[PDB]
Design a protein around this ligand. Structure first.
Ligand SMILES: *[C@@H](C(=O)O)[C@H](O)C(=O)N[C@@H](CC(C)C)C(=O)NCCCCNC(N)=[NH2+]
Length: 236
């Protein structure tokens, strides 16, 4: 399954890198948010996001791929009744690529039947690695956006702009992407550090789909278990 410490060194080597801000959105590494509507398929969106990013980052190609197919075909998961990020990545490999949603469009909880050969060209992930929770900003900076868990709550839903510092979920309950991190200074001077999350609740939600959760310079601070689970697909 490839351990992180051997993967990380091939893509970093050295730098040294800045822990204040890096935003993939701004450097052609995050494809637009989507909306899972009603249909418990975050795991599907969180997973396929990270792969869309890698095709963006590591080979130019903008491609958006079908989380429906993944909802229809990932038998290590439970379609709209839930799923897991890893399981998803594995199911992708067994399926041997995913269709570009443009061919295999999303119909949320509307009953649908898997159809592998619904698109001549598929899009694969070679393998996937876990990112350790103590090394997220490091991972983002060199490896790319990260499919990750988080304990979402009501306060989290009413987010609209700025740095979230509200209340947290009961348990890890939702999937999202990490796409970056940043820091703004606001004088009461006080440097305020945050991670940028991409969500799957439509662009109407928060900052065109995204949300900024408070953190620290290191990025050891993880609000709402931010990435107690953390995976990134390798397509290289
Ligand atoms: C995520 C969402 O759309 O909110 C979706 O409910 C989901 O899959 N959530 C995960 C939470 C993790 C932190 C990603 C989840 O609950 N996974 C386990 C579901 C599998 C077991 N459930 C059933 N019904 N077999």
């Amino acid at each position: 399954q490839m351990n992180y410490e051997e993967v990380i060194k091939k893509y970093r080597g050295e730098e040294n890198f800045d822990h204040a801000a890096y935003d993939w959105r701004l450097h052609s590494g995050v494809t637009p948010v989507k909306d899972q509507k009603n249909c418990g398929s975050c795991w599907a969106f969180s997973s396929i996001g990270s792969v869309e990013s890698q095709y963006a980052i590591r080979k130019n190609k903008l491609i958006t791929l079908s989380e429906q197919e993944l909802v229809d075909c990932s038998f290590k998961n439970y379609g709209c009744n839930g799923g897991l990020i890893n399981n998803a990545f594995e199911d992708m490999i067994e399926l041997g690529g995913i269709c570009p949603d443009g061919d295999y469009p999303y119909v949320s909880d509307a009953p649908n039947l898997c159809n592998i050969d619904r698109c001549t060209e598929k899009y694969g992930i070679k393998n996937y690695l876990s990112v350790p929770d103590n090394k997220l900003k490091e991972a983002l900076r060199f490896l790319g956006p990260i499919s990750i868990s988080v304990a979402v709550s009501d306060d989290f839903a009413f987010y609209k702009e700025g740095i979230f510092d509200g209340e947290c979920g009961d348990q890890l309950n939702h999937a999202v992407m990490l796409v970056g991190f940043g820091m703004k200074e606001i004088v009461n001077g006080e440097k305020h550090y945050y991670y940028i999350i991409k969500n799957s609740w439509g662009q109407q939600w928060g900052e065109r789909g995204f949300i900024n959760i408070e953190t620290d310079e290191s990025g050891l601070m993880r609000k709402c278990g931010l990435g107690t689970d953390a995976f990134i697909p390798l397509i290289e």
